[model samples]
Target: ATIGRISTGSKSLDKLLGGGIETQAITEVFGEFGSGKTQLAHTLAVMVQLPPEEGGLNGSALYIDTENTFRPERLREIAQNRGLDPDEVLANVACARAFNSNHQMLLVQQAEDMIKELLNTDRPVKLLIVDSLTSHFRSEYIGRGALAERQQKLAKHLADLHRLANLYDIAVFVTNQVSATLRVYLRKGKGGKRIARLIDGEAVFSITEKGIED
Candidate 1:
């Protein structure tokens, strides 16, 4: 059965993908700077709190910040604009700063612990967001020699996310940064490396400039 369903929070964005993000699956959003990936993430954090009829689960959000972009005040503004109680919205969502790659992974490992303490019952989480998933990995492990190790580590990270989404039945949204593809000629020095086809389905994100639409 579908445990968690991924919703884009925008009708147009949903339509573009032929529906919402897959339920109980990991959806990756990748883009260049100022491409609106983070903006969409913030919107989703607030949108997930709305009642189901409003295209939301009325559930809380768990946001893991790897780039230190998770802002509580900005979220308050977004929530208030949608007529939601800022404090209530903020209270529902949990935010944590990942100081390094190890810290980032540690937080991921701590999700279950936090949930267990929060509910003290098996109610289940509805959404999980990891903004800029590759920051630490990229920063910590670099170069062709470390590619294999990096990918392995990344795969493990993704596996954990998949398990959380499947075992716990929650939507997982991860954002990644784009890199320049180094090709012999056509792609030499061009920005296509980030769009590598290897992680295509595993990490995919659509573009949104104005945040979630009402």
Candidate 2:
């Protein structure tokens, strides 16, 4: 069965991406630094808490922060702006920070176990956010010599998240960092064709002097 998902109601983005993200699936959001990737994620965290009638799950969010990017203050502001109780809205967010790439993968592996314990009764989680999934990976592994192992490890991490998305009927949003392609002429071609095929989907945005825009 196809699980339903909510939208941030950004008319431009919603319409461009088929109303919103696909439920029961993992969506990858990748871009360069200061590209509004995290901004969009923060928006979704607040938006997904709306009631089902408003195109949300009325469910909570599980945020796995590998780079210490989940800010309570920002979330509170977004929640308040949307007319939601700041305390109640924040209460729904469960956060964890990963110290390194291996630790990050271990957290991904252990999340299912933790969620099973938390939701053992009847409550369900509706969203999972891994902000900057590529941070630790790219940081720890570098150069052509490490490509194979890095890809394999990243693939497994994604597989684990994908399995959880299907099992728990939630939306998975992952952000990745952009890298130079190193293919001479195609060095600037969005991190080369190889890197692009490692994930599922992509969304591009920019931060201007005014504000973040898509």
TM-score of each: 0.79, 0.79
The list of candidate 1 runs beyond 4 A from truth reads 1-6, 118-124, 179-210
- Candidate 2 lDDT score relative to the true structure: 0.68
- Which residue runs does candidate 2 get wrong by more than 4 Å? 118-123, 179-214
What TM-score does candidate 1 get on C-alpha atoms? 0.79
RMSD of 1: 6.8
lDDT of 1 at 49: 71
Best by lDDT: 2
lDDT of 2 by residue, 9-62 (tens): 454455545666666778776666655567667777877788877657777788
